[PDB]
Amino acid sequence: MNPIEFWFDFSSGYAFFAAQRIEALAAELGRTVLWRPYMLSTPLKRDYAQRDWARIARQRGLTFRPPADHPHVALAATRAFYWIEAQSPDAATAFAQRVFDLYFSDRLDTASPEAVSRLGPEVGLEPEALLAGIADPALKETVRKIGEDAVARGIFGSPFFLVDDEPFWGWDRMEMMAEWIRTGGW
């Protein structure tokens, strides 16, 4: 009832490294994490990001491989998360971890309903049902409200963390957020 909110886009390289450390960190700090996927210029700036991600991975001993036409528009994966989530928030976190993990080993088109639905029976969900659910109008309206509520609450970018109403934007802000939680704020 006082979770660390974890707002991210599945196509976010920085969210990938955050996704990954967030669970253990919140455990160390004795908090829960609420995972919240939501939808989101220069060549040289994109060239830098790539260098930075590779540089982060290399240091953490992580394998990191975005697909050739990164970033995917992860609409099917984002709809799938909230579909699962309505049934079981824990299954949804699990599903989210498997998206990041497959996406960033070059193994999942997160825009494809069909490809995303192959992740289901893995959270004990039939592809058919997941497929039906994300093709359901009420869920499509639900996911849209999630992101609009995000805008309305000042949430932008990925990863974005919200703890006790204090916002922290960025992967490199996780230790500051932790220091905020431990001290109670400054």
Ligand X SMILES: N[C@H](CCC(=O)N[C@@H](CS)C(=O)NCC(=O)O)C(=O)O
Could you say whether residue 148 binds a second copy (CB under 8 A)? no
By CB under 6 A, what part of segment 19-48 binds ligand X? 40
> Which option in Ca ion, ligand X, a second copy, none does residue 145 bind, with CB closer than 5 to 8 A by kind?
none
Residues in the chain: 186
Q: Order of strands, edge to edge, in the sheet holding 33-37?
A: 33-37, 4-8, 160-163, 166-169
d(Cα 86, Cα 82) in Å, to the nearest integer? 6
Counting contacts by CB under 8 A, is residue 170 touching a second copy? yes
118 contributes a contact to a second copy by CB under 8 A: no
Tell which one of 12, 78, 110, 117 touches ligand X (CB under 6 A).
12
- Per CB under 8 A, the segment of 17-25, 26-34, 37-45, 102-110 that binds a second copy is 37-45
Q: In 127-159, which positions are buried (b, 16+ CB within 10 angstroms) versus exposed (e)?
A: eeebbebbeeeebeeebeebbeebeeeebeebb
How far is CA 121 from its chain centroid? 20
CB of residue 47 vs a second copy: minimum separation in angstroms? 7
**What burial letters (b/e) apply to 8-32, b meaning 16+ CB within 10 Å?**
bbbbbbbbbbbbbebbebbeeeebe
Among 23, 67, 88, 101, binds Ca ion (CB under 5 A): 101
Residue 169: enclosing H or E segment and its boundaries? Answer: strand 166-169
Number of residues binding to a second copy, judged by CB under 8 A: 23
- Which residues on neighbouring strands pair with residue 112, listed in sequence order? none
**Residues that contact ligand X, how many (by CB under 6 A):** 12
Select from 12-20, 97-105, 109-117, 143-151 the region that touches ligand X (CB under 6 A).
Answer: 12-20
The single residue of 12, 41, 117, 158 carrying the catalytic annotation is 12
By CB under 6 A, residue 6 contacts ligand X: no
Q: According to the binding rule CB under 5 A, does residue 52 interact with Ca ion?
A: no
Q: Is 112 a catalytic residue?
A: no
Phi-psi region at 164: left, alpha or beta (left = phi > 0; alpha = psi -120 to 50)? left
Nearer Cβ to Ca ion (20/87): 20
- Residues at the contact surface with ligand X, assessed by CB under 6 A: 12-14, 40, 49, 156-159, 170-172
